[PDB]
């Protein structure tokens, strides 16, 4: 186990390192279909897929694609709901 | 049998003082009896007080 | 109950220490009465005060 | 057959009843106040209970089971033995103040109606007293642990 | 979830009673460890034979496996 | 410095949780101590010294005692005077210079008793000798003054 | 008195001048008053009360006439009548119906314009009715409404200590039965003020002026007190109108300051009887306390200006320390504060009054609608039927009987439990005392409890003191105050005249003790007698000062406490424990009356009602296990059906059995069938068995108990327990559930005992996990996994869309099925909305006595069976009889419950007959014994009342007069001890051991329903922790103190695994379970989800948090 | 504010309110692998021994009993051992010892 923990000021480099993508748009979801919007606050390719071993457009739906990133979709097929730890950032003017 | 409010008050300072000093330090205290000696010296405002 | 009774009695005795006896009264019957802060009675003399 | 009652209980009780009557006579004459009379009666009856307990302790044989249980330290104390055999003694009001008139009977003899009724006060009080006693202890314990 | 993992092992254990040549068809048809339900012709393409033969292998192996002597303990996995 | 472990009799091992053990040991017998009265009515209970759990709570909280008594700031001989309702105690330092005075001590509080084995001085007398840290009046010494 | 009473010789030496009244009157009388039965009418007019009015009559008269706002329309109610009940009590219980009867009231609509009168009879709904037992039946369950202790609508004065200045502050409050409050108080600055409707304080002179008093009249009336004159001087208000305006703006700050309303509200707030009422008891109390209208009849209950001024004068006199007051035109009355705990102030709401209040609320709701729609329907075409809406009243009645806090499931554990439940006095409940204000002060034994509330009997739960039991001789004043009887004593001779006194009036007389010695003429034979005086103080007074006496020694105790023999010798706490443990006894398979008991056990058995009593004298035409047929002397025939193996509310068996033979003659009121727990019509809560008082190898150490195996072989302590399981099929979003025998995926080994309907067959035995009712529920989308699809393929599983949810026996339960009750809306049966079929199954089991089961005597001595010994191992008497129970010696002395030893000795004397020699005259110790006790055969039951029974000397003398045994040798010596042999070693014990017969009973704390365990199970969704309780299969609590103990041990790993692995940590929990099952060593824990989310949030706040290893090393994961 | 008058919870508000983290619990956890029962005096036990009921011990040690049952071939899989323990077959008592 770890023995100590420290906190300090975070620089732009740290925030850009943590982030897997930028939320360029404010949209959350489509109104008539509850699927997440692209580049939105719930974007799948930024924060990961919502369903295990599958992407937005459904090209890949098998566990053997662990290290594959979808061509059309850009969502990295990942082991589980990595959405809980994966986070993004904003480049503000 | 007991609530948080009563239990908390059970451990407070609960300062106690003698009636003499307690009343001496209060302007609004109402006394049971007043004794005035050499009353001719008192003015209207002293009697009002 | 017993502890509180004993503590109250001890506190009363402590208070009565300063000026135990006020004065004395003489009856027309030649009897004598002593007034004080406490009642003191002789257990082995029929509790005559 | 093993719950022996001392033969000196009667003499002690009348001897102290005489002094209680003396206290009453002095109160009637105007030499005492109500609370002072109650305190004097409580003193007299505490003395009576003490002497009755001493007599009971002296009377019991060393091999009697009731007192053998206590003297060996295995269980109980002499106050319980006195209450069982000697006399119950004084009891408290709902306010927690001693009643001037004691319970001169012992549970071996059997309390009367009024004695039992006045005795129930302390028994009822203790149930709430024990429950309330734990709150302050828990408060101080939490402070100390913190 | 150990029963789920054990159930997976039992599949291979039950298939152990079948020949490799005929066991492969069951694996491809039901997509063992790949998931793709290979069609009778695709099993033919990967094997190099005609497709109706794959249906025949499926039928024979399926009749074999359904016997209690092979599926003895798998009934505990009812759902 | 802690020394013997009470539970096992051997020197304490590195890593013992002595603090929680001490807290539990102090707090467990808290139910046997006398407490403030549980009744809501009546006058404040500070007139009669309830020397139990309230006293322990007062001590651990380092609060000024309600029965405060002064202590001698300088070791020296005592000159004592009396008034209608107040005491006056002055200490002259035998090896020092200027005296010290306490001239507002309530006469209701009794002077400290010393009571040597056979000399038996009793209540503190004039001309007695008091060292630094000695207590002049009956009561509880203020921890902050000490 | 009872025709079939067994002859139980009594040790009582005092003759009771008054018999014990009907113990259930506290309920039947109230309900009779509520419904205005002719019996109550006659019993009331016998008291000189002219034209008594029933509760329903009173409420209807108060409700009507309802007059339209314009006065052109009116409606009146009168003449409430009741018809026959829809069905009998037994049928209602068997069919889940409510025991009720129709209610009809005559209603008259009146049109004042054209004079039309339309009189009809209106059905007000089905009013629930009380049975002969004093209980109600609601939805098939038996319920009881307990009386409530409430503060009476009097006027109460008190003095308190100010928190700030420590001065004495006197206050008064007027508490009405209905309406707003009014109160006055003297402030710490000697300023008299008044609070109207709880609102902001203001000078009392404002109220005095608002009532029309001028400054001159106020000065004249209240000139005696300087504080009142000072308040008037400092009162910056003049005239009646200005004061009225001030009060109006005080009570209605947001309304315009109109003079009309300002005058009207004050009149309509207190003084006009529409919205204010003292309820004829508040008026009586106010008149008595203030000395107003002395000797006048009660004409109206409204407040008047005279009594408000009298209250103000009373408060002012009290503040200045005066002791007596006389009011102009009144009578002198003492000035004193009021003890709200005194039963001169607390009154009793019986069931009748509570139901009356609920009906009043319902009719108040009805009146609003009636008067509202009087103004919406066409005139002269409006019958009472068109505007009488009976929905609100029926809804109120249903709500009270279904959700009220006073209507409770009857405590049907045993007959005594139910009998004592019907006679409760509960301070808690609506309109009683606040939930959080139940401090230790109210729950105490006030002196006024004597003779009207038992001080010993009370529940052990959180309601200690808040719930009491009515005394045996007490009864209820029509005002609600509890009366108790006393014999009148004149000139020192006891008279046969008996007067009933309330606690308020008892304090005005000197009351002597019940058992004071007296001569044949009744005159006292002692110079000084013990008496109770005004303050509840017990003292000694001359024989010429007594005014009254107790009717009997048993006056103070209740029904349960009256059944403890030798109650003198048991301490109050242990007497309380024994009295409450008597209520927890479980009925045995064969009941047996105690050898030594009290005369109450008979009456209590009959008044409970569980025993069948012949109504009319006649001959038993036919007798059977199921029913008894009786042919009366007058030719009428009666049939009594006995209830067999019926499940009580608490799972105990209520089996009855007849005790009469065909052709036998039975007198009226004779018991013809034993109840669940009685023998020959008297209480048989337990068994009497042989006890030896000695320690034994430590198996009875620390209050444990040792039993002989005989009690297991002979079914002495065996009891039958019945459990009721329930299930139903409901409509769902995917459709309706179904009950079937074709439940999926189960072997025939599982459902062999199921009937065609899918319900377990009657008579089959079931064990935990067995299916009782086969039920299936539709499922949603399947979406089979590849593995699941393969399994379907390899077993040929055809698709189906149902899932098994069949009812199963709970964990650790078993028994034989004894009954099934099935309901279905298709048969017109009432069911909850969205439900089709419902099934209830009864499983009965025969529990023997086992280790851990709780036993106890009547004296508060209780324990758990720690060992059951073979018969040959028990110590045995010289004749070879082995003892049944062994009780440790060390538990008797310190508990101050030596009455158990008295019971043991007297039980031994009763088991073996006794014969006192009279050859040379009666022995000196036998002088007080009645002649009836000079001899008796073996197994001769005896009676010893609680406060007048066998004395120590008499019992000691009797112990030496016992008859020999079969061989002619006396087993027990004169000291009550015997020489016992060792069952194991065979050597005689070195010293004699006390031996006798004790009556002990089996409590409902059996280990079978207390053992619990859990390795893994359900979890709470809200907090993720394991569920709680045995029913939910929950885990044990691990409090903070346990964490402190673990820290003090230094057991870091154990505490960590307790807080994380065995708690809300899903991943770690599953990992540990997998490791254990697979044999892998337990994986290490770390990094819980809470810390992960906290770290993520910290990062979100731009705080660069990171975890480092060692004393300054790199990061890890 | 948004809808109504309620304010929007900021990020720092996740660390400040009565609900959140950096917060202790005065109430204790409920823990698996735990049981409860009445106690009676066992005078034949040694100071380090206690008597444990068979039914309670079986529930407490269920997973270990299942492991041992599968090891000894009394059950062919974890599911069979689970069914055996739940139904209390005769053999589980030999493995529990
Ligand atoms: Zn995609």
Curated annotation (Swiss-Prot), chain D:
It comes from the Bacteria. The RNAP catalytic core consists of 2 alpha, 1 beta, 1 beta' and 1 omega subunit. When a sigma factor is associated with the core the holoenzyme is formed, which can initiate transcription. DNA-dependent RNA polymerase catalyzes the transcription of DNA into RNA using the four ribonucleoside triphosphates as substrates. Belongs to the RNA polymerase beta' chain family. Coiled coil: none annotated. This is DNA-directed RNA polymerase subunit beta'. The chain holds residues 733 to 878 of 1317 of the full protein. It comes from Mycolicibacterium smegmatis (strain ATCC 700084 / mc(2)155) (Mycobacterium smegmatis).
From Swiss-Prot, chain F:
This is DNA-directed RNA polymerase subunit beta'. Belongs to the RNA polymerase beta' chain family. The chain holds residues 977 to 1122 of 1317 of the full protein. DNA-dependent RNA polymerase catalyzes the transcription of DNA into RNA using the four ribonucleoside triphosphates as substrates. The RNAP catalytic core consists of 2 alpha, 1 beta, 1 beta' and 1 omega subunit. When a sigma factor is associated with the core the holoenzyme is formed, which can initiate transcription. The lineage of its organism: Bacteria, Bacillati, Actinomycetota, Actinomycetes, Mycobacteriales. Zn(2+) 2 binds at residue 1. It comes from the Bacteria. Coiled coil: none annotated.
Swiss-Prot record, chain G:
The keyword Manganese does not apply. Signal peptide: none annotated. PROSITE patterns: RNA_POL_BETA. Pfam families: RNA_pol_Rpb2_1, RNA_pol_Rpb2_2, RNA_pol_Rpb2_3, RNA_pol_Rpb2_45, RNA_pol_Rpb2_6, RNA_pol_Rpb2_7. It catalyses: RNA(n) + a ribonucleoside 5'-triphosphate = RNA(n+1) + diphosphate. The RNAP catalytic core consists of 2 alpha, 1 beta, 1 beta' and 1 omega subunit. When a sigma factor is associated with the core the holoenzyme is formed, which can initiate transcription. Interacts with RbpA, which partially restores Rif-inhibited transcription. This is DNA-directed RNA polymerase subunit beta. It comes from Mycolicibacterium smegmatis (strain ATCC 700084 / mc(2)155) (Mycobacterium smegmatis).
